[PDB]
Amino acid sequence: MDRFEEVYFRIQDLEMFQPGRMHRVGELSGDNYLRSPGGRQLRAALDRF
Amino acid sequence: PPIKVLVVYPSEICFHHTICYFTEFLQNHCRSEVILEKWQKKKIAEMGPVQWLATQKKAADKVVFLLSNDVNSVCDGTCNSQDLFPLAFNLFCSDLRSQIHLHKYVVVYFREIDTKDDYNALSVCPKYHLMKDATAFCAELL
Amino acid sequence: PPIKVLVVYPSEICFHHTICYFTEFLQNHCRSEVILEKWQKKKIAEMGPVQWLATQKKAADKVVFLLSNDVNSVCDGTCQDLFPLAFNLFCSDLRSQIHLHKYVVVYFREIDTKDDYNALSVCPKYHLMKDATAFCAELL
Amino acid sequence: IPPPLKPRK
Amino acid sequence: GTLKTSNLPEELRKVFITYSMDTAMEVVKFVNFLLVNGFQTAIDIFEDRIRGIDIIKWMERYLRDKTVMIIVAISPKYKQDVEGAESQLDEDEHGLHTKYIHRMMQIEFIKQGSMNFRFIPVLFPNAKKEHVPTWLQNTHVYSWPKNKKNILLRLLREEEFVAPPRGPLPTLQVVPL
Amino acid sequence: GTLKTSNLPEELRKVFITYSMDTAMEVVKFVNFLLVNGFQTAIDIFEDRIRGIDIIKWMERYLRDKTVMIIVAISPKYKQDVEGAESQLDEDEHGLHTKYIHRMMQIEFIKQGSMNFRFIPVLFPNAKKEHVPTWLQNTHVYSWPKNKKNILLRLLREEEFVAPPRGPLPTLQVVPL
Ligand SMILES: [Zn+2]
Ligand SMILES: [Zn+2]
């Protein structure tokens, strides 16, 4: 969740950077992860633990 | 004909300004190919950073060490985690004590270099202040 | 407190006689703290030669280059190494013209002017206790 | 140009 | 939350229990629990009227049926029965019948490629995981009454956690450098 | 060199061999070799009587005992049975029994903390390392008859190279400077 966007790229087998351009996933970005529905559930569980 | 160059830098260097600008300068002005840890994360994952680092170190025709951020563009330096700089420095020290392939290593800086022992050790390699030494650095690569 | 001094030399120099005499000479006459590679080998193993050498160069208050044996003591003459790396570091300092005051040259036998010594010519040269008095004055 | 994503297991 | 109706066909509600005498007291309560929760439990004590006609036929009726779920009530005496019941000083008829049922279960288990589709080991209070027959240790071992909810789920043939269908892929973005 | 006595207790000289039918001939040769070298080997074809009394009890007798060492005869058919699909098992009972023995070996291996104290895989002439079951690949894989000496050493629970007791610390001499 501090690097999860990289984790999802590893899962998708995609490079995050390339010559002169960058690849991003909007929803899975840190703040967007926090704002996501399931992201809130994960955040709550982590805070509880 | 093509030529390939490896780039090293600590995490302190801002990627968005300094590294992007330097990569584009290398690709266009210097007429060379750039190898970066950012671009080959899949290969790093397969090999592991140490093996990948050594592979690039032996494979690369030239190696560039960047010790300070750019000044041509104003940045806060942010755009806290383990990086390859200490390992790259150890491998460079191995090569230096071997006193072989010393030509490959080149030191590049824009802002004044910090007062650190590792940088002094790297200072043994040729220096190029790209604020003024763009053409000389390009010739060195070519 | 004492002042720290670093000693550099190639492997071609007789270590035992010359270096031990010079160590006692520094400790007693020069009121200095001596840094030598043989004792630092334990620390060199942890840090490694290059990084340890750079750290000592950056930390030492004075740097001493010894270029000849102490022929005054009977010896057999022979009773890679750090010296090329230290010389390259000093050359980088010279071309940067930084911390030149730290470096000193010492010789006992007549000094053969090697090609590398041309760069070392900047450092003051001292011979025996006669010039050691001035060396102590320089340190203190 | 973004590459096409695919479902993964 | 929300409530889901249980749509298990009645023929799948059949259950058969094998046990030893030390557990009989607790097994009575276990059968009470199962019958109350709608499962048709077949245990010898309640079936004695029909079982008495032909004991071996009665056992084989449940051992043949693939849809019948068998519950193995583990206990210190159970291991003794299934391993050396005939070695006892006296003949324990129930011990021998338990041993026979265990052999039939093992034979069916091997025939299926060592896949345990319908044998549910349950550790009763005075039982320890060591008493579980080795081949049964390769599946979930429930402890009664601690895990009775899980036992009911297993009998209903439902997973405690059910994943949703695979969701949509996220948005992919490109940013020039 | 010099000769010396062998001191393995007879109770630890029991060896059990599991295999697929394709290696039957080489397995018989291997059993001959082991018996001639003084190891009490248990194999189905030679113990067919006691095994015939009760097959599953016979297999369990050797799987339970920790002192018994089990030698796994690897072959293309072994991995096909133990790990392969069950549809092929509809034509072979011995395949089912080998699969059951493999399951029991896995259960023991996990039960011992994933440490292989007594399972000794062996590669037979028509075998490859790819055929070794994955969990067995984590330890030494011998080949027959190439490494029969190593196999005997392993069964004796000896080590080919043995170090002597640590000697006295060396003398240190001090010299002034
Ligand atoms: Zn920036
Ligand atoms: Zn000497």
XYZ file of C-alpha atoms and ligand atoms in Angstrom:
696
model
C 0.000 0.000 0.000
C 3.085 2.200 0.047
C 4.208 0.522 -3.181
C 1.074 -1.444 -4.079
C 0.795 0.246 -7.469
C 4.129 -1.411 -8.215
C 2.715 -4.680 -6.863
C -0.199 -4.506 -9.285
C 2.217 -3.851 -12.142
C 4.219 -6.915 -11.116
C 0.961 -8.872 -11.194
C 0.082 -7.472 -14.620
C 3.698 -7.969 -15.758
C 3.981 -4.342 -16.889
C 6.829 -1.875 -16.531
C 5.962 1.300 -14.649
C 8.446 3.466 -16.574
C 9.579 3.673 -20.187
C 11.560 6.109 -22.376
C 9.926 9.512 -22.063
C 6.672 8.235 -20.559
C 5.219 6.868 -17.327
C 2.444 4.350 -16.671
C 0.040 4.817 -13.763
C -3.147 3.233 -12.437
C -5.464 5.911 -11.103
C -7.609 3.898 -8.704
C -4.702 1.951 -7.194
C -2.634 5.054 -6.408
C -2.039 5.620 -2.708
C -4.682 8.279 -2.146
C -7.017 6.640 -4.663
C -6.478 3.332 -2.866
C -7.530 5.041 0.363
C -10.611 6.465 -1.363
C -11.556 3.139 -2.955
C -14.358 1.145 -1.256
C -12.333 -1.994 -0.594
C -9.373 0.212 0.234
C -11.323 1.693 3.138
C -12.065 -1.809 4.438
C -8.392 -2.765 4.206
C -7.408 0.482 5.938
C -9.859 -0.176 8.769
C -8.627 -3.744 9.250
C -4.996 -2.611 9.263
C -5.710 0.149 11.775
C -7.525 -2.341 14.006
C -4.626 -4.799 13.885
C 26.647 3.019 -34.319
C 24.790 2.487 -31.030
C 26.273 2.740 -27.553
C 24.881 1.800 -24.143
C 25.438 3.586 -20.829
C 24.393 2.742 -17.270
C 23.190 5.437 -14.863
C 23.564 5.380 -11.074
C 22.381 7.859 -8.455
C 21.291 7.944 -4.811
C 17.654 8.389 -3.873
C 18.368 12.058 -3.086
C 18.356 12.862 -6.814
C 14.988 14.078 -8.074
C 13.903 11.737 -10.855
C 11.273 13.938 -12.489
C 13.576 16.905 -13.082
C 17.179 15.744 -12.875
C 16.973 12.151 -14.078
C 14.458 12.806 -16.856
C 16.443 15.780 -18.148
C 19.725 13.864 -17.987
C 18.211 10.820 -19.708
C 16.904 12.966 -22.550
C 20.251 14.765 -22.824
C 22.052 11.416 -23.017
C 19.640 10.051 -25.618
C 19.680 13.108 -27.886
C 22.830 15.200 -27.403
C 25.174 12.365 -26.404
C 23.689 9.933 -28.959
C 23.675 7.013 -26.504
C 21.334 4.428 -24.985
C 20.418 4.704 -21.297
C 19.981 1.852 -18.810
C 18.056 2.669 -15.636
C 16.814 0.653 -12.684
C 13.437 2.346 -13.159
C 12.992 1.085 -16.714
C 13.873 -2.581 -16.082
C 11.955 -3.419 -12.902
C 10.807 -6.710 -14.436
C 14.398 -7.764 -15.109
C 15.409 -6.653 -11.611
C 12.630 -8.789 -10.150
C 13.687 -11.823 -12.185
C 17.414 -11.547 -11.445
C 17.373 -9.688 -8.144
C 18.911 -6.229 -7.829
C 22.450 -7.344 -6.989
C 22.767 -9.769 -9.893
C 21.090 -7.287 -12.236
C 23.370 -4.503 -11.022
C 26.469 -6.610 -11.648
C 25.169 -7.692 -15.057
C 24.703 -4.084 -16.145
C 28.025 -3.068 -14.586
C 29.905 -5.610 -16.690
C 27.762 -5.122 -19.799
C 27.629 -1.326 -19.916
C 30.118 0.402 -22.196
C 30.082 3.475 -19.936
C 28.882 4.092 -16.386
C 27.752 7.487 -15.078
C 27.532 8.481 -11.412
C 25.304 11.443 -10.544
C 25.935 12.956 -7.112
C 23.870 16.167 -7.142
C 20.542 17.413 -8.450
C 20.010 19.696 -11.424
C 20.006 23.482 -11.077
C 18.714 24.258 -14.569
C 15.249 23.403 -13.212
C 14.036 24.333 -9.730
C 12.775 21.427 -7.628
C 12.339 20.388 -4.010
C 14.278 17.154 -4.594
C 11.452 14.818 -3.567
C 10.075 13.973 -7.022
C 13.258 6.825 2.539
C 13.795 3.419 0.925
C 16.643 1.090 0.031
C 18.544 2.070 -3.114
C 21.351 0.700 -5.261
C 23.874 3.457 -4.519
C 25.787 1.689 -1.700
C 26.011 -1.523 -3.725
C 27.029 0.291 -6.906
C 29.715 2.061 -4.884
C 31.016 -1.260 -3.553
C 31.209 -2.715 -7.058
C 32.963 0.427 -8.301
C 35.452 0.065 -5.447
C 36.075 -3.536 -6.492
C 36.770 -2.412 -10.055
C 38.987 0.445 -8.853
C 41.081 -1.888 -6.710
C 41.299 -4.111 -9.783
C 42.410 -0.998 -11.713
C 40.679 -2.396 -14.809
C 37.890 -0.801 -16.867
C 38.512 2.531 -15.123
C 37.613 4.269 -18.394
C 33.980 3.163 -18.108
C 33.275 5.229 -14.984
C 32.339 8.906 -15.329
C 31.208 11.378 -12.658
C 28.512 13.953 -13.435
C 27.157 16.732 -11.236
C 25.120 19.918 -11.604
C 24.977 21.294 -8.055
C 28.119 21.284 -5.931
C 29.095 17.778 -4.850
C 28.559 16.974 -1.182
C 31.381 16.374 1.305
C 31.184 12.583 1.517
C 33.892 9.922 1.470
C 32.158 7.827 -1.193
C 31.988 10.817 -3.540
C 35.696 11.484 -2.981
C 36.367 7.865 -3.918
C 34.302 8.360 -7.076
C 36.175 11.616 -7.727
C 39.084 9.524 -9.032
C 37.099 9.054 -12.236
C 36.895 11.854 -14.825
C 34.649 14.760 -13.830
C 32.163 16.673 -15.984
C 30.156 19.663 -14.737
C 27.246 19.451 -17.165
C 26.224 23.007 -16.300
C 29.079 23.909 -18.676
C 30.659 20.605 -19.756
C 27.887 19.239 -22.007
C 30.060 18.999 -25.125
C 33.050 17.541 -23.274
C 30.823 14.927 -21.633
C 29.264 14.035 -24.995
C 32.731 13.601 -26.495
C 33.774 11.474 -23.518
C 30.812 9.165 -24.099
C 31.537 9.111 -27.838
C 44.802 15.794 22.910
C 47.225 14.595 20.216
C 47.055 15.277 16.489
C 46.255 12.486 14.036
C 48.694 11.603 11.247
C 48.418 9.085 8.407
C 51.371 7.133 6.998
C 51.447 5.947 3.376
C 54.145 3.915 1.635
C 54.554 1.309 -1.115
C 55.257 -2.339 -0.371
C 58.816 -1.945 -1.708
C 59.818 -0.285 1.577
C 61.185 -2.379 4.442
C 58.294 -2.305 6.895
C 59.746 -3.507 10.182
C 62.766 -1.292 10.814
C 61.804 1.922 9.028
C 58.112 1.928 9.926
C 58.529 0.917 13.578
C 61.275 3.507 14.053
C 59.048 6.117 12.407
C 56.122 5.126 14.641
C 58.158 5.550 17.823
C 59.559 8.737 16.280
C 56.058 10.156 15.789
C 54.707 9.049 19.169
C 57.632 10.365 21.218
C 58.884 13.348 19.210
C 55.853 14.561 17.251
C 53.143 14.227 19.937
C 50.938 12.667 17.259
C 48.468 9.808 16.870
C 49.629 7.283 14.275
C 47.414 5.570 11.694
C 48.909 2.544 9.936
C 47.399 -0.115 7.693
C 48.657 -3.177 9.589
C 46.583 -2.375 12.675
C 43.716 -1.132 10.502
C 43.584 -4.477 8.668
C 40.991 -5.551 11.234
C 38.903 -2.489 10.380
C 39.774 -2.778 6.680
C 38.103 -6.191 6.645
C 34.835 -4.640 7.835
C 35.028 -1.516 5.667
C 37.200 -2.706 2.790
C 40.442 -1.130 1.567
C 39.096 1.607 -0.702
C 36.398 2.928 1.627
C 38.659 2.657 4.673
C 41.454 4.475 2.845
C 39.118 7.280 1.782
C 37.768 7.576 5.329
C 41.271 7.839 6.786
C 42.284 10.388 4.146
C 39.241 12.523 4.963
C 39.699 12.124 8.725
C 43.462 12.441 9.216
C 44.758 15.855 10.251
C 48.049 15.253 8.415
C 49.146 12.792 5.731
C 52.710 11.455 5.545
C 54.334 9.841 2.507
C 57.458 7.772 3.217
C 59.511 6.953 0.134
C 62.764 5.351 1.333
C 64.027 2.834 3.862
C 65.847 3.624 7.110
C 69.250 2.398 5.955
C 70.701 3.490 9.309
C 69.434 0.165 10.714
C 70.935 -3.134 9.576
C 68.426 -5.084 7.492
C 68.212 -7.711 4.771
C 66.442 -5.197 2.514
C 63.314 -7.333 2.050
C 62.319 -8.351 5.601
C 49.198 -5.288 -5.137
C 48.972 -2.709 -2.353
C 47.292 0.509 -1.263
C 49.907 2.947 -2.549
C 48.587 3.384 -6.133
C 45.099 4.090 -4.786
C 46.387 6.577 -2.208
C 48.480 8.283 -4.887
C 45.440 8.575 -7.159
C 43.409 10.058 -4.303
C 46.171 12.587 -3.635
C 46.310 13.419 -7.355
C 42.568 14.075 -7.290
C 43.122 16.363 -4.300
C 45.927 18.188 -6.122
C 43.898 18.718 -9.293
C 41.059 19.918 -7.069
C 43.629 21.821 -4.958
C 41.919 20.864 -1.697
C 43.454 19.942 1.677
C 46.986 20.277 0.284
C 48.261 21.398 3.698
C 47.739 17.915 5.151
C 50.299 16.080 3.013
C 53.974 15.725 3.963
C 56.895 13.771 2.482
C 59.596 11.939 4.445
C 62.743 10.183 3.241
C 65.841 8.777 4.926
C 67.848 7.257 2.093
C 68.503 9.485 -0.902
C 65.141 9.829 -2.620
C 64.890 8.445 -6.143
C 62.631 10.860 -8.033
C 59.982 8.520 -9.393
C 57.564 9.755 -12.039
C 54.758 9.766 -9.466
C 56.898 11.809 -7.061
C 56.620 14.778 -9.437
C 53.120 15.329 -8.050
C 54.363 14.730 -4.496
C 56.870 17.583 -4.873
C 54.256 19.982 -3.466
C 54.568 18.479 0.008
C 57.308 19.600 2.423
C 60.246 17.196 2.658
C 61.841 16.149 5.956
C 64.988 14.117 6.639
C 65.744 12.559 10.036
C 65.269 14.126 13.475
C 66.943 17.332 12.269
C 63.934 18.119 10.080
C 61.689 16.269 12.529
C 62.072 19.227 14.867
C 60.557 21.476 12.191
C 57.958 18.764 11.558
C 56.949 18.903 15.228
C 56.729 22.684 14.945
C 54.479 22.258 11.896
C 52.233 19.777 13.715
C 52.021 21.946 16.839
C 0.118 4.674 -25.221
C -1.329 2.564 -22.386
C -1.053 -1.209 -22.863
C -4.146 -3.431 -22.562
C -4.838 -4.822 -19.105
C -5.922 -8.440 -18.719
C -7.454 -10.424 -15.850
C -4.878 -12.202 -13.704
C -4.847 -14.988 -11.133
C -26.732 -8.686 7.198
C -28.970 -10.792 4.967
C -30.449 -14.283 5.195
C -30.050 -17.065 2.627
C -32.425 -20.019 2.452
C -30.883 -23.488 2.609
C -31.732 -25.349 -0.608
C -29.970 -28.656 0.093
C -31.917 -31.627 -1.339
C -33.212 -33.937 1.367
C -31.230 -36.954 0.149
C -28.055 -34.971 0.870
C -29.225 -34.307 4.434
C -28.483 -37.920 5.409
C -25.608 -38.390 7.866
C -24.025 -41.469 9.447
C -21.930 -41.523 12.620
C -19.251 -43.982 13.724
C -17.883 -43.814 17.250
C -16.681 -45.774 20.264
C -18.281 -46.478 23.611
C -16.302 -43.853 25.534
C -17.865 -41.160 23.344
C -21.426 -42.521 23.385
C -22.595 -39.942 25.930
C -21.293 -37.000 23.900
C -22.390 -38.576 20.620
C -25.976 -38.585 21.877
C -25.753 -34.818 22.383
C -24.088 -34.429 18.989
C -26.961 -36.271 17.324
C -29.435 -34.096 19.217
C -27.636 -31.074 17.793
C -27.676 -32.435 14.244
C -31.312 -33.568 14.282
C -32.429 -30.225 15.692
C -30.602 -28.506 12.825
C -32.429 -30.565 10.205
C -29.842 -33.236 9.417
C -31.037 -36.839 9.266
C -28.487 -38.632 11.445
C -28.173 -42.406 11.205
C -26.572 -43.815 14.359
C -26.989 -47.343 15.644
C -28.694 -46.439 18.929
C -31.721 -44.872 17.234
C -31.702 -47.375 14.359
C -31.533 -50.484 16.564
C -35.048 -51.483 15.501
C -34.016 -51.682 11.839
C -30.326 -52.358 12.420
C -31.198 -55.487 14.396
C -32.597 -57.220 11.315
C -29.135 -57.401 9.741
C -26.268 -55.407 11.246
C -23.851 -55.839 8.343
C -26.514 -54.900 5.807
C -27.367 -51.814 7.857
C -23.739 -50.675 7.889
C -23.246 -51.435 4.197
C -26.316 -49.382 3.315
C -24.620 -46.196 4.496
C -21.128 -47.223 3.419
C -22.250 -47.779 -0.185
C -24.089 -44.476 -0.575
C -21.851 -41.730 -1.944
C -24.259 -38.939 -0.982
C -24.192 -39.933 2.699
C -21.732 -37.946 4.811
C -19.932 -39.983 7.473
C -18.770 -38.395 10.729
C -15.894 -40.076 12.562
C -16.045 -39.457 16.308
C -12.419 -39.621 17.445
C -11.458 -40.596 20.983
C -8.756 -42.552 22.816
C -10.733 -45.780 22.562
C -11.455 -45.183 18.878
C -7.815 -45.599 17.892
C -7.568 -48.778 19.958
C -10.669 -50.145 18.239
C -9.614 -49.314 14.699
C -6.102 -50.673 15.276
C -6.301 -53.718 17.571
C -9.904 -54.293 18.656
C -9.516 -58.068 18.335
C -6.393 -57.962 20.528
C -8.494 -57.114 23.590
C -8.894 -59.620 26.405
C -12.615 -59.941 25.644
C -14.563 -59.559 22.405
C -16.044 -56.070 22.082
C -18.657 -56.471 19.354
C -19.088 -52.724 18.921
C -15.319 -52.370 18.714
C -15.162 -54.940 15.931
C -17.988 -53.255 14.030
C -16.203 -49.914 14.350
C -13.024 -51.514 13.022
C -14.923 -52.971 10.073
C -16.484 -49.601 9.281
C -13.048 -47.999 9.442
C -11.637 -50.572 7.034
C -14.478 -49.957 4.600
C -13.908 -46.202 4.845
C -10.200 -46.673 4.134
C -10.931 -48.924 1.157
C -13.328 -46.379 -0.320
C -10.803 -43.613 0.342
C -8.085 -45.486 -1.546
C -10.410 -46.398 -4.414
C -11.183 -42.713 -4.965
C -7.509 -41.894 -5.392
C -7.034 -40.956 -1.731
C -9.552 -38.130 -2.087
C -11.679 -37.686 1.045
C -15.039 -36.552 -0.301
C -17.330 -37.577 2.559
C -15.402 -38.473 5.759
C -15.460 -35.758 8.428
C -13.226 -36.505 11.450
C -14.468 -34.828 14.623
C -12.392 -34.668 17.797
C -14.548 -35.186 20.835
C -13.701 -33.555 24.166
C -11.436 -36.302 25.522
C -9.659 -36.705 22.162
C -6.289 -35.487 20.913
C -5.047 -34.861 17.394
C -2.728 -37.851 17.787
C -5.735 -40.170 18.005
C -6.904 -39.188 14.511
C -6.095 -42.010 12.066
C -3.190 -40.864 9.935
C -5.059 -40.854 6.630
C -7.805 -38.678 8.122
C -5.256 -36.086 9.248
C -4.983 -34.994 5.608
C -8.284 -33.096 5.915
C -9.950 -30.626 8.246
C -10.317 -31.957 11.789
C -13.161 -30.351 13.719
C -13.376 -30.253 17.507
C -16.789 -30.665 19.105
C -18.530 -28.609 20.485
C -16.023 -25.838 19.788
C -16.451 -25.802 15.993
C -20.087 -26.852 15.629
C -20.838 -23.929 13.308
C -18.068 -25.103 10.994
C -19.401 -28.662 11.233
C -22.832 -27.449 10.136
C -21.279 -25.523 7.256
C -19.320 -28.589 6.168
C -22.427 -30.775 6.269
C -24.416 -28.174 4.333
C -21.492 -28.164 1.878
C -21.018 -24.389 1.982
C -17.916 -22.237 2.310
C -17.682 -19.880 5.264
C -16.149 -17.190 3.035
C -17.435 -16.743 -0.520
C -15.600 -14.510 -2.959
C -17.492 -12.125 -5.254
C -17.224 -12.414 -9.039
C -14.045 -11.041 -10.575
C -14.331 -7.272 -10.621
C -13.570 -4.788 -13.383
C -10.042 -3.823 -14.318
C -8.786 -0.426 -13.103
C -7.993 2.668 -15.134
C -4.626 2.794 -16.911
C -2.981 6.215 -17.207
C -0.048 7.536 -19.244
C 2.015 10.548 -18.147
C 4.745 11.983 -20.410
C 8.151 12.694 -18.909
C 43.159 -47.934 5.123
C 41.912 -50.257 7.856
C 38.760 -52.300 8.398
C 36.297 -51.759 11.230
C 33.135 -53.291 12.647
C 29.618 -52.164 11.739
C 27.445 -51.497 14.788
C 23.929 -50.830 13.468
C 21.363 -52.575 15.717
C 19.324 -55.229 13.937
C 16.068 -53.446 14.789
C 17.225 -50.528 12.622
C 18.015 -52.811 9.663
C 14.415 -52.749 8.395
C 13.898 -51.190 4.960
C 10.615 -50.662 3.115
C 10.511 -50.164 -0.652
C 7.734 -48.449 -2.601
C 7.710 -48.430 -6.383
C 5.676 -48.562 -9.569
C 5.184 -51.707 -11.612
C 7.368 -50.500 -14.489
C 10.493 -50.881 -12.330
C 9.633 -54.370 -11.046
C 12.707 -56.139 -12.448
C 15.232 -53.561 -11.268
C 13.383 -53.444 -7.946
C 13.875 -57.192 -7.526
C 17.564 -56.768 -8.316
C 17.762 -53.956 -5.762
C 16.085 -56.093 -3.100
C 18.568 -58.879 -3.826
C 21.385 -56.375 -3.385
C 20.024 -55.065 -0.091
C 19.341 -58.501 1.394
C 22.804 -59.717 0.406
C 24.291 -56.652 2.118
C 22.392 -57.557 5.282
C 19.334 -55.295 5.221
C 15.924 -56.730 6.082
C 13.847 -55.390 3.190
C 10.047 -55.311 3.120
C 8.506 -55.335 -0.361
C 5.040 -56.402 -1.434
C 6.094 -59.121 -3.877
C 8.263 -60.914 -1.291
C 5.873 -60.548 1.668
C 2.796 -61.407 -0.396
C 1.326 -63.661 2.306
C 1.172 -61.314 5.293
C 0.289 -58.559 2.839
C -2.504 -60.742 1.486
C -3.998 -61.101 4.952
C -4.657 -57.342 5.004
C -3.047 -54.952 2.520
C -3.791 -51.654 4.260
C -2.701 -52.931 7.663
C 0.497 -54.175 6.034
C 1.291 -50.778 4.515
C 0.466 -48.995 7.771
C 2.748 -51.320 9.727
C 5.733 -49.958 7.819
C 4.522 -46.369 7.472
C 3.933 -45.926 11.217
C 7.366 -47.124 12.311
C 9.829 -44.242 12.466
C 12.849 -46.561 12.578
C 11.961 -48.150 9.230
C 13.637 -46.372 6.327
C 11.578 -46.035 3.154
C 13.207 -46.138 -0.282
C 11.178 -44.551 -3.077
C 11.801 -46.016 -6.528
C 11.274 -43.145 -8.965
C 10.180 -43.708 -12.554
C 7.965 -42.119 -15.215
C 5.035 -44.195 -13.989
C 5.610 -43.309 -10.332
C 4.942 -39.610 -10.848
C 2.114 -40.517 -13.220
C 0.428 -42.511 -10.454
C 1.134 -40.505 -7.318
C 0.740 -37.046 -8.863
C -1.068 -37.789 -12.118
C -4.773 -37.785 -12.842
C -7.023 -40.419 -11.290
C -8.575 -41.445 -14.620
C -5.484 -43.534 -15.380
C -5.838 -45.233 -11.988
C -9.097 -46.898 -13.065
C -6.968 -49.583 -14.759
C -4.437 -50.304 -11.976
C -4.885 -51.194 -8.304
C -1.170 -51.146 -7.494
C -1.195 -47.564 -8.726
C -3.838 -46.775 -6.119
C -1.780 -48.420 -3.385
C 1.332 -46.485 -4.412
C -0.707 -43.275 -4.408
C -1.939 -44.046 -0.896
C 1.597 -44.728 0.311
C 2.692 -41.439 -1.250
C -0.053 -39.584 0.605
C 1.014 -41.178 3.874
C 4.630 -40.214 3.192
C 3.577 -36.610 2.566
C 1.518 -36.579 5.761
C 4.480 -37.881 7.746
C 6.836 -35.395 6.090
C 4.683 -32.414 7.028
C 3.977 -33.899 10.458
C 7.732 -34.026 11.124
C 8.066 -30.318 10.345
C 8.866 -30.805 6.650
C 12.115 -32.599 7.537
C 12.958 -35.784 5.620
C 14.541 -38.130 8.131
C 13.764 -41.482 6.500
C 12.495 -41.042 2.906
C 15.283 -41.884 0.463
C 14.361 -41.288 -3.197
C 16.197 -43.393 -5.762
C 16.420 -42.865 -9.516
C 16.131 -46.035 -11.545
C 17.670 -46.483 -15.002
C 14.685 -45.106 -16.932
C 14.107 -42.201 -14.516
C 14.836 -38.475 -14.548
C 15.036 -35.852 -11.824
C 11.841 -34.338 -13.228
C 9.943 -37.438 -12.097
C 10.911 -36.960 -8.443
C 7.949 -35.662 -6.396
C 8.487 -32.010 -5.579
C 8.716 -32.322 -1.800
C 11.333 -35.050 -2.249
C 13.452 -32.873 -4.548
C 14.489 -30.951 -1.429
C 16.894 -33.737 -0.372
C 19.502 -36.048 -1.857
C 18.346 -37.979 -4.921
C 20.452 -41.087 -5.481
C 20.640 -43.135 -8.674
C 20.716 -46.901 -9.111
C 22.991 -48.802 -9.603
C 25.428 -45.906 -9.936
C 25.313 -44.761 -6.298
C 24.617 -48.041 -4.497
C 27.565 -47.378 -2.178
C 26.075 -44.048 -1.099
C 22.709 -45.758 -0.641
C 24.264 -48.357 1.656
C 26.005 -45.627 3.640
C 22.726 -43.735 3.993
C 20.851 -46.841 5.134
C 23.598 -47.516 7.671
C 23.075 -43.881 8.729
C 26.802 -43.254 8.287
C 28.658 -40.357 6.686
C 31.175 -40.960 3.916
C 33.634 -38.309 5.139
C 33.987 -37.917 8.906
C 35.981 -35.251 10.701
C 38.269 -35.970 13.666
C 37.775 -34.297 17.051
C 38.849 -30.669 17.146
C 42.549 -30.437 17.915
C 44.256 -28.210 20.469
C 44.505 -24.522 19.711
C 47.795 -23.587 18.000
C 50.668 -21.970 19.864
C 50.944 -18.185 19.514
C 54.327 -16.438 19.603
C 54.829 -12.762 20.484
C 57.579 -10.579 19.015
C 58.352 -6.943 19.939
C 58.626 -4.050 17.510
Zn 11.434 17.299 -9.191
Zn 64.348 -4.356 7.813
